[PDB]
Amino acid sequence: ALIERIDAIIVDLPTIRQQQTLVVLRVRCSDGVEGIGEATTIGGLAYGYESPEGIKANIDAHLAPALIGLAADNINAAMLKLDKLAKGNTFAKSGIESALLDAQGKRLGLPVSELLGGRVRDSLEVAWTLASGDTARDIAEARHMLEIRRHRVFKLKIGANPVEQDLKHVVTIKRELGDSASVRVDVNQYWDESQAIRACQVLGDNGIDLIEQPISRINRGGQVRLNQRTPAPIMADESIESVEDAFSLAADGAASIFALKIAKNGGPRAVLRTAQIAEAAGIGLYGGTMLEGSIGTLASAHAFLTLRQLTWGTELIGPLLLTEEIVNEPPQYRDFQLHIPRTPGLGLTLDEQRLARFAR
Amino acid sequence: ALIERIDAIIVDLPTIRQQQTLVVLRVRCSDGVEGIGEATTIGGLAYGYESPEGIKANIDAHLAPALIGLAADNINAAMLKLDKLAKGNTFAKSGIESALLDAQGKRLGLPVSELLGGRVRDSLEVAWTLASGDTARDIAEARHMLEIRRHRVFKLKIGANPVEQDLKHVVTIKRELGDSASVRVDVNQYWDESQAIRACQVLGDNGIDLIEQPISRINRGGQVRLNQRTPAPIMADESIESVEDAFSLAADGAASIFALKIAKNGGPRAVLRTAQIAEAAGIGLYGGTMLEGSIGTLASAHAFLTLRQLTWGTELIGPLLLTEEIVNEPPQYRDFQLHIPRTPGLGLTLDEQRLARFAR
Amino acid sequence: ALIERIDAIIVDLPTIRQQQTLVVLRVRCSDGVEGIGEATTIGGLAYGYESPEGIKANIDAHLAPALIGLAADNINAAMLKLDKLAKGNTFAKSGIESALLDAQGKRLGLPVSELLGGRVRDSLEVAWTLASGDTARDIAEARHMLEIRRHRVFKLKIGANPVEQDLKHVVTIKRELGDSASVRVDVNQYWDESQAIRACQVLGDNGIDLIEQPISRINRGGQVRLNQRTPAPIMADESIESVEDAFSLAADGAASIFALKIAKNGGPRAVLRTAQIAEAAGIGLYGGTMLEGSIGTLASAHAFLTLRQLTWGTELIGPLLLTEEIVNEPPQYRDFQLHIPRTPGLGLTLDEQRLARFAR
Amino acid sequence: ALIERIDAIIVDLPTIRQQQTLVVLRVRCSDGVEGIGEATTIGGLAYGYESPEGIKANIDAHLAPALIGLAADNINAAMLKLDKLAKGNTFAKSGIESALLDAQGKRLGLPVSELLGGRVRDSLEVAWTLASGDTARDIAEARHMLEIRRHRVFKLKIGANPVEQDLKHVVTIKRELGDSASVRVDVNQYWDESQAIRACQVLGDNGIDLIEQPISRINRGGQVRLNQRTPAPIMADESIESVEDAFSLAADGAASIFALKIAKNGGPRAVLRTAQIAEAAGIGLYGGTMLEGSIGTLASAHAFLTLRQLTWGTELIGPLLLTEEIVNEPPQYRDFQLHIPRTPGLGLTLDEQRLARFAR
Ligand SMILES: [Mn+2]
Ligand SMILES: [Mn+2]
Ligand SMILES: [Mn+2]
Ligand SMILES: [Mn+2]
**DSSP sequence for D132-172:** SS-HHHHHHHHHHHHHTTS-SEEEEE--SS-HHHHHHHHHH
CA count, 13 A, side-chain hemisphere, B185: 31
CA distance B122 to chain C (A): 12
**Yes or no, beta carbons of C75 and B117 under 8 Å apart:** yes
Q: Which residues of B are catalytic?
A: 157, 315
What is the sign, positive or negative, of the torsion defined by CA atoms of A251, A252, A257, A263? negative
Q: Is A215 on the interface with B (CB under 8 A)?
A: yes
What are the CA-CA distances from residue C43 to residues A81, A158, B190, C113, C214 (Å)? 15, 41, 59, 30, 20
What are the CA-CA distances from residue C267 to residues A47, B150, C209, C261, C305 (Å)? 21, 40, 28, 8, 15
B257 alpha carbon, closest ligand: 2
Mutation pick from C67, C87, C245 vs chain A, by most beta carbons of A within 10 Å, is C87
Q: What are the φ and ψ backbone dihedral angles of A279, each rounded to 5 degrees?
A: -65, -40
Chain B's closest residue to A193, CA to CA, is B256
Furthest CA-CA distance within chain C: 60
Q: Which residues of A are catalytic?
A: 157, 315
CA of C213 to the centre of ligand 3 (A): 6
Nearest to B104 by CA among C111, C115, C122: C115
Q: Is C231 on the interface with D (CB under 8 A)?
A: yes
Q: CA A58, A59, A64, A66: dihedral to nearest 10 degrees? A: 30
Three-class SS of chain C: CEEEEEEEEEEEEEECCCEEEEEEEEEEECCCCEEEEECCCCCCCCCCCCCHHHHHHHHHHHHHHHHCCCECCCHHHHHHHHHHHCCCCHHHHHHHHHHHHHHHHHHHCCEHHHHCCCCCCCEEEECEEECCCCHHHHHHHHHHHHHCCCCCEEEEECCCCCHHHHHHHHHHHHHHHHHHCEEEEECCCCECHHHHHHHHHHHHHCCCCCEECCECCCCHHHHHHHHHHCCCCEEECCCCCCHHHHHHHHHHCCCCEEEECHHHHCCHHHHHHHHHHHHHHCCEEEECCCCCCHHHHHHHHHHHCCCCCCCCCECCCHHHHECCCCECCCCEEECCEEECCCCCECCCCECHHHHHHHEC
Per the CB < 8 A criterion, the answer to whether B325 and B293 are in contact is yes
**Interchain contact A/D (3 or more Cβ pairs less than 8 Å):** no
> Which approach determined this entry?
X-ray
Cβ-based contacts of B73 with chain C (< 8 Å): 114, 118
Give the β-pairing of D284-287 and C153-157.
Answer: unpaired
3-state secondary structure of B184: strand
Residue D76 makes CB contacts below 8 A (sequence gap 6+) with none
Q: Which chains touch A (3 or more CB pairs under 8 A)?
A: B, C
Per the CB < 8 A criterion, the answer to whether B101 and C144 are in contact is no
**Yes or no, beta carbons of C44 and A61 under 8 Å apart:** yes
**Yes or no, beta carbons of A49 and C248 under 8 Å apart:** no
Q: Is B104 on the interface with C (CB under 8 A)?
A: no
Q: What angle do CA D333, D335, D337 make, to 5 degrees?
A: 55
Residue type, B265: N
CA of A265 to the centre of ligand 1 (A): 14
Per the CB < 8 A criterion, the answer to whether B345 and B108 are in contact is no
Q: What are the φ and ψ backbone dihedral angles of C271, each rounded to 5 degrees?
A: -60, -30
Residue type, B185: V
Q: What angle do CA C97, C99, C101 make, to 5 degrees?
A: 70
Q: Is B49 on the interface with D (CB under 8 A)?
A: yes
Q: Which residues of D are catalytic?
A: 157, 315
CA count, 13 A, side-chain hemisphere, B100: 30
C38 is in an annotated binding site: no
Q: What are the φ and ψ backbone dihedral angles of B65, each rounded to 5 degrees?
A: -55, -25
- From the annotation, which residues of B make up the binding site? 186, 212, 237
Q: Can you tell me the distance from the alpha carbon of D213 to that of D320, in angstroms, rounded to the nearest whole number?
A: 24
Q: Is C160 on the interface with A (CB under 8 A)?
A: no
Per the CB < 8 A criterion, the answer to whether D16 and D85 are in contact is no
Cβ-based contacts of B257 with chain A (< 8 Å): 194
Question: Quick one: DSSP state of residue A40?
Answer: -
Q: What are the φ and ψ backbone dihedral angles of C84, each rounded to 5 degrees?
A: -75, -35
Nearest to C225 by CA among C195, C193, C247: C193
Residue type, A270: A
Chain B's closest residue to C244, CA to CA, is B280
Residue D43 makes CB contacts below 8 A (sequence gap 6+) with none
Q: What angle do CA D29, D31, D37 make, to 5 degrees?
A: 35
Per the CB < 8 A criterion, the answer to whether D21 and D38 are in contact is no
- Order the strands of the A123-125 sheet from edge to edge: A123-125, A337-339, A332-334
Q: DSSP states of A196-242 as a string? A: HHHHHHHHHHTT---EE--B-TT-HHHHHHHHHH-SS-EEESTT-SS
Furthest CA-CA distance within chain A: 60
**Yes or no, beta carbons of C250 and B247 under 8 Å apart:** yes
Q: How many CB atoms are closer than 10 A to CB A332? A: 12
Cβ-based contacts of C244 with chain A (< 8 Å): 218
Q: Is C218 on the interface with A (CB under 8 A)?
A: yes
Q: Can you tell me the distance from the alpha carbon of B154 to that of B175, in angstroms, rounded to the nearest whole number?
A: 13
Per the CB < 8 A criterion, the answer to whether D253 and D247 are in contact is no
Give the β-pairing of D337-339 and B34-38.
Answer: unpaired
D329 is in an annotated binding site: no
Question: Quick one: DSSP state of residue D184?
Answer: E
Q: Can you tell me the distance from the alpha carbon of D101 to that of D86, in angstroms, rounded to the nearest whole number?
A: 20
**Yes or no, beta carbons of A222 and B311 under 8 Å apart:** no
**Yes or no, beta carbons of C51 and A58 under 8 Å apart:** yes
Nearest to A255 by CA among A228, A286, A274: A228
* Residue B88, H or E segment: none
Cβ-based contacts of D21 with chain B (< 8 Å): none
**Yes or no, beta carbons of A51 and C58 under 8 Å apart:** yes
Nearest to C272 by CA among C52, C119, C124, C85: C119
Q: Is A45 on the interface with C (CB under 8 A)?
A: yes
User: In DSSP terms, which residues pair with A24 in a beta bridge?
Assistant: A9, A38
CA of B274 to the centre of ligand 4 (A): 29
CA of C272 to the centre of ligand 3 (A): 18
Domains defined for chain A, CATH in brackets:
1-109+346-358 (3.30.390.10), 110-345 (3.20.20.120)
Q: Is C311 on the interface with D (CB under 8 A)?
A: yes
Q: Can you tell me the distance from the alpha carbon of A158 to that of C332, in angstroms, rounded to the nearest whole number?
A: 54
B156 alpha carbon, closest ligand: 2
Q: Is D356 on the interface with B (CB under 8 A)?
A: no
